[PDB]
């Protein structure tokens, strides 16, 4: 029920089992048994030993598109305000775009008439 | 083990200081960016799936 450590073999080590090795360089290992410990101390690669967890996941032994965007009211405009603004589809935007054209034409011609 | 629960759709993230490890063991040995049905945290979390997104060690 303590921490469960993992071996040379990558197996789960339970309390009261195996040994712990503290090298002088500061790295500390733990081993399940003397088979795993001797394999480590002989500098044998765990990825070349068939019963090792590292081998079985290297060789693959035994083994989506989400998109959601939500509209939120911001600081300066409520959700009611932004929805009405973006739902001016029935010729309301046409009304804005046609008063814009006449205002632009009348202001530009008036600016030409302002000078003499 | 504090929990910085956050809902992106509403902000309003808050820090919850649980003490029952049984609630948290539905999270144990789950990687980041994984979705866990958090029905093991009281009765207020029914129908909730949550995504792990990080944390800090005992040393921060």
């Amino acid at each position: 029920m303590k921490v469960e450590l993992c071996s040379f073999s990558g197996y789960k080590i339970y309390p009261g089992h195996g040994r712990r090795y503290a090298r002088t360089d500061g790295k500390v290992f733990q081993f399940l048994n003397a088979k795993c410990e001797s394999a480590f101390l002989s500098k044998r690669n765990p990825r070349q030993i068939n019963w090792t967890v590292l081998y079985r996941r290297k060789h693959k032994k035994g083994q989506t598109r989400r998109a959601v965007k939500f509209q939120r009211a911001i600081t300066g405009a409520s959700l009611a305000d932004i929805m009405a603004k973006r739902n001016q589809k029935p010729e309301v935007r046409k009304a804005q775009r046609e008063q814009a054209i006449r205002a632009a034409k009348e202001a530009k011609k008036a600016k030409q008439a302002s000078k003499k | 083990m504090k929990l910085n629960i956050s809902f992106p759709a509403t902000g309003c993230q808050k820090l919850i200081e649980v003490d029952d490890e049984r609630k948290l063991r539905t999270f144990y040995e789950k990687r980041m960016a994984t979705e866990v049905a958090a029905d093991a945290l009281g009765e207020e979390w029914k129908g909730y799936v949550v995504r792990i997104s990080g944390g800090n060690d005992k040393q921060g």
Binding site: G18, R19, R20, A22, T24 | -
Partner: protein, 131 residues
């Protein structure tokens, strides 16, 4: 606090262990162990955290033909740690200390057993890491 529990000894009298401090000695030849009442024919042996009397066999000549106190900080014999872990180190090592407990040197190279650390605070402060 709490006193030190019993551990497997591993290092009899006559064992030459490394010297993990920067005092200028390369090894320590154990000649006796502190607190050993002893028995007929039994060698006094020491584990980690034990104070020993030792003579450096090689190193600076000014340390050589003298008897110094020392404290074992790493041992190559496995010892049980009251919670099932059998810990052993890559090598036997010790540091030269005085009878008051303070270390002659100022640095320790390598890990130090936890039993030795909390028994000698002055070793614990200088320890690079605790095993």
């Amino acid at each position: 606090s709490g006193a030190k529990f019993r551990i497997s000894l591993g290092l009899p009298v006559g064992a030459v262990i490394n010297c993990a401090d920067n005092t200028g000695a390369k090894n320590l030849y154990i000649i006796s162990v502190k607190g050993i009442k002893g028995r007929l024919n039994r060698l006094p042996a020491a584990g980690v955290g034990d104070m020993v009397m030792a003579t450096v066999k090689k190193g600076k000549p000014e340390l050589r033909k003298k008897v110094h106190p020392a404290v074992v900080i790493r041992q190559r014999k496995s010892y049980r740690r009251k919670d099932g872990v059998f810990l052993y180190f890559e090598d036997n090592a010790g540091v030269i200390v005085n009878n008051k407990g303070e270390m002659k040197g100022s640095a320790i190279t390598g890990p130090v057993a936890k039993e030795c650390a909390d028994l000698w605070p002055r070793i614990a402060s200088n320890a690079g890491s605790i095993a």
